[PDB]
Design a protein around this ligand. Structure first.
Ligand SMILES: N[C@@H](CC(=O)O)C(=O)O
Ligand SMILES: N[C@@H](CC(=O)O)C(=O)O
Ligand SMILES: N[C@@H](CC(=O)O)C(=O)O
Ligand code: NA
Ligand code: NA
Ligand code: NA
Lengths: 396, 396, 396
């Protein structure tokens, strides 16, 4: 009887679920036909248009979110909110790497460190907005990390100054809300885009793919929800229902940085999470908090060691280190595996074998990477209760 | 007796007319001499300096004009102003294509649609400001269309929010006026630049060139002025005298997007047109309203059919479609002719024959493209009388 | 007895002096070892990280400084402050070229003028922030001159408008202070960076190197200090002690444009110089006022003439002209020597011989280039006394 009101209310959520169900059907139907690379690009195009729309809003989001996020909070309160986030991030990326290692047991690398260091401190801000550094020397594609860093320091700087800083805070606050109004339009195209984005990909190792997928279920649907209930004492699967549009889009894009604007609209609107805490937890979580990637890094390094064959402590240290370094971009998990392979001693040429089934694992690990930030905000919000209480009463 | 006051008042206008008269003389004098490509570039340089100055101001103009233009107007009033503009644009591009077809009778193409679609939704705003998409994949040169789209949606978003949006409206209003103060300095260099810009070009098919030029006179000096008198009931050749500096510069540059800042100063200062309506009509008209290009597209497709040899309805549909797609950049008419040739069935390799005389036709068709936007603003302003009456009295 | 308080107070200044002393020691110790180019890059990396941090802040500094600098001053007062600066700049670059010529006596070039002219008027502002023009055609690296020009005109434009302009002035004032708060963090990394930046360079003509170095001492420590005492009637070597951190960093970077944010913090904090005058004198001085380069240009053109062999007036005219054209970037002195060699008649291929010892002379000539701007601000501030008196009392 009550399923009619469920169809009327969850209309946009159900259309995106149907987009996955019908998108998988469409792809397998069109798969036997001539798989021409130019034709595959044309077929997947309605999914490419959604990707462009989402990519567009990440820069005015990341920048405006952290500048207001850190300036709208008290001096030490900004540090406390950050400490809570960092403590949460490093523990979750440690639980996933430990859970990942146990499961797999049952079933130019210096240039990487330098390029990362170079990107933390960009030589040009206008460049940083569309270019990243990759020594061969500046490859195309936004330097998210470099902008996240600069925005954090810039936010602190406006917080340091008085009413002079207030103008820019108000400027960046108006710019945040305006781009957030645009992600409402992006959300309506999402059912159409998600269909073609996943149909195109399913158009384009046995135990391994299983170990990772099952490993992500134990972490994502059993480990992380328990952490939320242990801190907030609220039902985590009702919270996951709010951010469900953000997970379905993370499956489609396979880029947590690309689905960041929808996770903002899901945490801010569908759930009762504060903007003052989502403006910090979500942009930082999108680039450093990667639980799904950390689990994948550990399993994939030991899976190649199952064929090639005590020092799993270095693997747990570097797989958690690779999870931080890795980009909120798709296929970033296989390129950062160079660090975890060279550390143990295994050859980096073995990534080639995994590359084939990587695409599908990437879609699921992105969903767990997003989920960690989403449940993260809810955890940090509840913990930073008095900080938000002091800021609300102050205005009165 | 009264010609002395005419020389004192119209000093800058007369210097730009003299720039064309003396510029044509200078070019034909220097034409027999060694036409070295490096030497031609050096000779035309004072014209290249004007081009850089004008190109510079288009980005802070297009962006600041539409953001304030759509936010400073009421919800449905913004839609009404737009409806009036769109109705005016599509009818004028239909009259020109019909007039063009009658006169000529008397005397990778999917990748184009995809690249256009890609550009309507840019993946990066900082990139969009100096790069356009052109699959082979991101060519240099501003994505005007992508910025016009985003600015329109961003304007609407600030209009949607209340007083929070007002700060950014005021910010973008100050930024519009400041760049408009700079186009006053650009206007003084214009007589010097226009001389060398046209002298250099005249230094660098019989019936065809005539059909187009005569076709643009019937449309520009007889069709469009009659439309203005039919709606406003005001003398159109006194209005054309106000925007006369913008037409002379359109002849020189051959880029309606480049002469957009001067058409703003001509419509806002020389004529009594409202900023609230020029901020929408002029930037949108510069990229989609191309009457001179639509007339050219129809004549050039049938001129090649006069040699190569019922279905002129597809030509009228795609030539009007090419007019929208075409860029406010020079030589954009010959590249968009691919769409109108493939639609009818004629070969795209026939554009090569036309390319020679194209340059001079481009200068005249740009003047008609600008004229359509200029007389367009005057037409839409007069029609949207009550909308501006309600906004003025509200402030009181 | 008083040396203990001298160590406590001048802690950051002494750490940067020690950075040079220990940096020269470190380099000569590591010099005999395999000098691999990839290894040299890795070794110098902590110096490369400082360079990125400093480069980062130049764009939001140059732009925000001149826009507020010229808008916060009266119409003719802006012209007077400028006249004082221009008169000071051209006389100092004339004294250095005269002093340089006397000492050396005792002991595609049109494309350069066009590229400079092109860069004074950039075709795109977003591009200008990370790209310069260099015909072969748009090379990577910020167009400082093009941004300095545009910012000056934009500042004047906000000054021209009333309270409408005030919002953007306040916006650019908040943006200036916020980036100036960031150069405090950059200053703490500077001792670590300066050590590796100079150690790496000392790891990588007899009379000539001496003539230039001795020539810079006569100008920098005898000519320029006397000018300050002659105008301000204040001790110049107490003023040099304030901007001493900016000189030590100019030695390290060899780029006056890169050390511009630290010279701002030195003149604004360590010395009692007004922001209203440093916001104009320092960014303009960084690109056009190059006393150390002008002295170098004259000596290097006549040193090649000492080997290869009345018309030294053209050398003094073009060496002062090259000093203006030259970039606040390292090794910009040898590339601009093409202008001064072609003018006299000497071959440009002779720059190859000088290139070897150029690096060390560049570090010293940058220190004199910075010093001229630093003592320049102090000279112009004292001269524009009443202008600042009228602006202060007005607010009361
Ligand atoms: N796709 C992941 C990163 C990766 O593991 O490739 C993300 O966007 O978070
Ligand atoms: N030159 C025209 C476009 C074209 O037809 O090439 C304009 O700028 O409007
Ligand atoms: N290095 C100098 C320029 C040069 O002479 O190379 C400066 O930055 O001012
Ligand atoms: Na990460
Ligand atoms: Na068009
Ligand atoms: Na200079």
């Amino acid at each position: 009887e009550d399923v009619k009101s469920f169809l009327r209310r969850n209309a946009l959520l159900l259309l995106t679920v149907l987009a996955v169900i019908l998108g998988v059907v469409l792809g397998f139907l069109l798969r036997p036909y001539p798989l021409s690379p130019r034709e595959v690009k044309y077929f997947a195009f309605p999914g490419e248009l959604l990707m462009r729309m989402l990519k567009m809003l990440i820069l005015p989001l990341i920048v405006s979110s952290l500048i207001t996020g850190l300036a709208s909070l008290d001096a030490k309160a900004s540090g406390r909110l950050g400490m809570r986030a960092v403590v949460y991030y490093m523990s979750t990326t440690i639980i996933a790497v430990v859970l990942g290692i146990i499961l797999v047991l049952i079933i130019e690398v210096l240039d990487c460190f330098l390029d990362l260091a170079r990107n933390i401190f960009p030589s040009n801000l206008v460049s940083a907005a569309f270019r990243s550094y990759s020594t061969t020397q500046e490859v195309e594609g936004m330097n998210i990390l470099g902008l996240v860093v600069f925005s954090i320091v810039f936010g602190i700087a406006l917080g340091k100054m008085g009413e002079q800083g207030q103008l820019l805070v108000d400027f960046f606050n108006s710019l945040n809300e305006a781009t957030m109004k645009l992600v409402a339009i992006i959300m309506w195209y999402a059912p159409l885009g998600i269909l073609f984005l996943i149909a195109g990909k399913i158009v384009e190792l046995g135990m391994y793919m299983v170990t990772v997928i099952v490993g992500l279920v134990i972490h994502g649907l059993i480990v992380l929800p328990l952490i939320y209930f242990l801190i907030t004492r609220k039902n985590p699967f009702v919270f996951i229902a709010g951010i469900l549009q953000a997970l379905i889009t993370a499956l489609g894009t396979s880029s947590s940085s690309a689905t960041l604007p929808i996770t903002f609209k899901c945490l801010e609107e569908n759930n009762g999470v504060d903007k003052r805490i989502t403006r910090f937890v979500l942009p930082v979580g999108a680039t450093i908090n990667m639980d799904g990637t950390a689990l994948y890094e550990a399993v994939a390094a030991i899976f190649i060691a199952q064929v090639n064959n005590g020092q799993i402590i270095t693997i747990s240290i570097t797989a958690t280190a690779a999870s931080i370094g890795a980009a909120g971009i798709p296929q970033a998990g296989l390129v950062t595996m160079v660090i975890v392979l060279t550390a143990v001693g295994l050859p980096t040429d073995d990534i080639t074998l995994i590359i084939a089934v990587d695409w599908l694992l990437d879609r699921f690990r992105t969903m767990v990477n997003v989920l960690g930030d989403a449940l993260g905000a809810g955890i940090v919000e509840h913990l930073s209760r008095k900080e938000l209480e002091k800021q609300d009463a102050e205005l009165g």
